[PDB]
């Protein structure tokens, strides 16, 4: 029996950076080589386990998070790296074990005129804890009592759309990305083939 990989990598529409799609994948004879028939795999690097010798090892619980980011921000999904998407809307721990897979996809995501469908939290108060997802879309403060639902000194909504178009440089193109979280210590082999 196989498990959901061709239902995590062939999704029609991916979620936004601040709305990643958490999932669990267990009870399956898991073959990590269905990946290689997918794409050129622009970004593929594994921490804690080698990709070549992956198909044999077994894991406790494997989580998968899928979303879409810009071109020059794929580097920010790494343990301990600070930025604007890592420090504001998606942060993974320093002891992370698993790996990340990002493949440029702008044949299905950029429209002529700007696809205002993917957003990302630009403003917040402080950093977030690992794997902490929030959806609140209140109007950001303005230091003093803000211009709640109005304009003024500093009343800036927190979400901002990416707006992909087919004239953007390769640095501004959309990139789909999936993050796999493993467990390896004393594991009761439940997902492996």
């Amino acid at each position: 029996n196989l498990c959901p990989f061709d239902e995590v990598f062939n999704a029609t529409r991916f979620a936004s950076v601040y709305a990643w799609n958490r999932k669990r994948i267990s009870n399956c004879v898991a073959d990590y080589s269905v990946l290689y028939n997918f794409a050129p795999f622009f970004a593929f690097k594994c921490y804690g386990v080698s990709p070549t010798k992956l198909n044999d090892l077994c894991f406790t619980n494997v989580y998968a998070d899928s979303f879409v980011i810009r071109g020059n921000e794929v580097s920010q999904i790494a343990p301990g790296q600070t930025g604007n998407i890592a420090d504001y809307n998606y942060k993974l721990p320093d002891d992370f074990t698993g790996c990340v897979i990002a493949w440029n996809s702008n044949k299905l995501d950029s429209k002529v005129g700007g696809n205002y469908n993917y957003r990302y939290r630009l403003f917040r108060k402080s950093n977030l804890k690992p794997f902490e997802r929030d959806i609140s879309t209140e109007i950001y403060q303005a230091g003093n009592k803000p211009c709640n639902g109005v304009a003024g000194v500093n009343c800036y909504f927190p979400l901002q759309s990416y707006g992909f178009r087919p004239t953007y440089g390769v640095g501004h193109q959309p990139y789909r990305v999936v993050v796999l979280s493993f467990e390896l210590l004393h594991a009761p082999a439940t997902v492996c083939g």
């Epitope: 029609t12 044949k107 299905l108 429209k111 469908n117 178009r165 087919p166 004239t167 440089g169």
Partner: antibody, heavy 118, light 108 residues
Framework: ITLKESGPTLVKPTQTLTLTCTFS??????????VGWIRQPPGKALEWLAL???????RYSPSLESRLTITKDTSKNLVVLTLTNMDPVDTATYYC???????????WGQGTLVTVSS | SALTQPASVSGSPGQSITISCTAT?????????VSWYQQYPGKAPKLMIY???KRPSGVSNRFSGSKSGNTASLTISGLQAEDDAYYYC?????????FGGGTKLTVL
């Protein structure tokens, strides 16, 4: 893949012109697929008009927007373009081609010549 | 104004010829997708090449594009009498797709 346009061949000044482009071989459900319209005056260059994506996100040409409302019906696979206020400038050929992101307008239809005058 | 194409070209039959589609406009973006169309004497344009140096399977192996920066050099090798036709270039700008002014190719 195949497309075919149809509609009124003749129209009078300051009138609402309508055209229906029926396609076969593909649908408007798969990703990337979209449908746009183009016109060409006699002996002049082609031009863009509008576009309807597969996500029901619609786009028009900047100069000539606020008109030519492009609608669609995915059950019988038909797209409809309607542009009002006919002028003698609008007398030209019209084509409905399918757009992918890189291969822009790779599948064109036949095209129907339409006249705008008394 | 949006793109720019020469008036016409006439190459002797059996030779090569290049055509230029300069943008002549700032901020056309990255100028990465530039498609070329074959216009017959009163027929629907046919896609010849897309994605600069790329080409859709179904056409000959003589057409080849290039980019000297801001333009698209459409090339035609082994010119045959069948190639007498109109040619156009096409590439989105920030707001909307634009076309070229047209080019005429008559073989003599």
């Amino acid at each position: 893949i195949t497309l075919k346009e149809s509609g009124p061949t003749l129209v009078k000044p300051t009138q609402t012109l309508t055209l229906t482009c029926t396609f076969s071989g593909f649908s408007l459900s798969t990703g990337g697929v979209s449908v746009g319209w183009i016109r060409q005056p006699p002996g002049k260059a082609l031009e863009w008009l509008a576009l309807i994506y597969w996500d029901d996100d619609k786009r028009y040409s900047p100069s000539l927007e606020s008109r030519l409302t492009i609608t669609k019906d995915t059950s019988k696979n038909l797209v409809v373009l309607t542009l009002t206020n006919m002028d003698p400038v609008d007398t030209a050929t019209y084509y409905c081609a399918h757009k992918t992101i890189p291969t822009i307008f790779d599948y064109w239809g036949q095209g129907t010549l339409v006249t705008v005058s008394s | 104004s949006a793109l720019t194409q020469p008036a016409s070209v006439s190459g002797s039959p059996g030779q090569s010829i290049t055509i230029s589609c300069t943008a002549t406009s700032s901020d056309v973006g990255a100028y990465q997708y530039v498609s070329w169309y074959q216009q017959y004497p009163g027929k629907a344009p046919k896609l010849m090449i897309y994605e600069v140096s790329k080409r859709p399977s179904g056409v000959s192996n003589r057409f080849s594009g290039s980019k000297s920066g801001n333009t698209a050099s459409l090339t035609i090798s082994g010119l045959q009498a069948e190639d007498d036709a109109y040619y156009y270039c096409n590439s989105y700008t920030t707001s909307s797709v634009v076309f070229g002014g047209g080019t005429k190719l008559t073989v003599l």
